[PDB]
Amino acid sequence: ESQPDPTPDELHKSSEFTGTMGNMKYLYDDHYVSATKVMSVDKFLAHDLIYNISDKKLKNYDKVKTELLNEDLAKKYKDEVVDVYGSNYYVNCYFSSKDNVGKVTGGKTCMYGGITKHEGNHFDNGNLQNVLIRVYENKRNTISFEVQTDKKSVTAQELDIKARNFLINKKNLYEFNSSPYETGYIKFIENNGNTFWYDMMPAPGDKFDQSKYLMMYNDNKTVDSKSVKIEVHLTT
Ligand SMILES: [Zn+2]
Ligand SMILES: [Zn+2]
């Protein structure tokens, strides 16, 4: 069983968000944690995994905590060599640390999901997979573009991040104060017909909780990059 399309009344409307859209833009504008062939070295709470990942670019962190849907998922990846890709946040990000030759025995940055096994998850000959994104504006297919990934089974999160990064730079998806769009959702259609979507707009109100918004990625949902179909539905 897949997820039914969004009803008219459940989609978040940007006009109803009176906070600063820049806080949403932040999460997707050339913003992401990426690591290759790493293994967790610790755990804060039962549902999370701690990794030693330092962004050689900007160097804002050396420790990354990613929270999963439950202990079973965490245990599945805990001792495997994995690849990581996701959107991180700092506000309300906390977890005690104990190590040396790094930070002051403290945390650094947080995220949800974003984990894929490294072994057997890449294409031969170092090929990259192009994934097509069809964008619909007011029920009209205005533009289509491609994003790439080197993973066979990639997290929906990675594809979502790359799709929004493009849209932010090419269509001003999110601006500092607001957005030119009223509603927007990204829909994934799998080869087996299964479908699911994420609301691209912040919940109504004057504040945006980045931690709460990103939590949707904690299911570590992955899709076959070779066959998945993606659609972005926007309205002005
Ligand atoms: Zn649990
Ligand atoms: Zn890999």
From Swiss-Prot:
Its cofactor is Zn(2+). InterPro entries: Enterotoxin (IPR008992), Staph/Strept_toxin_CS (IPR006126), Staph_tox_OB (IPR006173), SuperAg_toxin_C (IPR016091), Superantigen_bac (IPR013307), Toxin_b-grasp_Staph/Strep (IPR006123), Toxin_bac (IPR006177). Possesses two zinc-binding sites. The zinc ion is necessary for the toxin interaction with MHC class II. Disulfide bonds join 93-110. Keywords: Disulfide bond, Enterotoxin, Metal-binding, Secreted, Signal, Superantigen, Toxin, Virulence, Zinc. It holds the Pfam family Stap_Strp_tox_C. Its main location: secreted. One of its GO terms (cellular component) is extracellular region. Interacts with host MHC class II molecules composed of alpha/HLA-DRA and beta/HLA-DRB1 chains. Belongs to the staphylococcal/streptococcal toxin family. This is Enterotoxin type C-2.
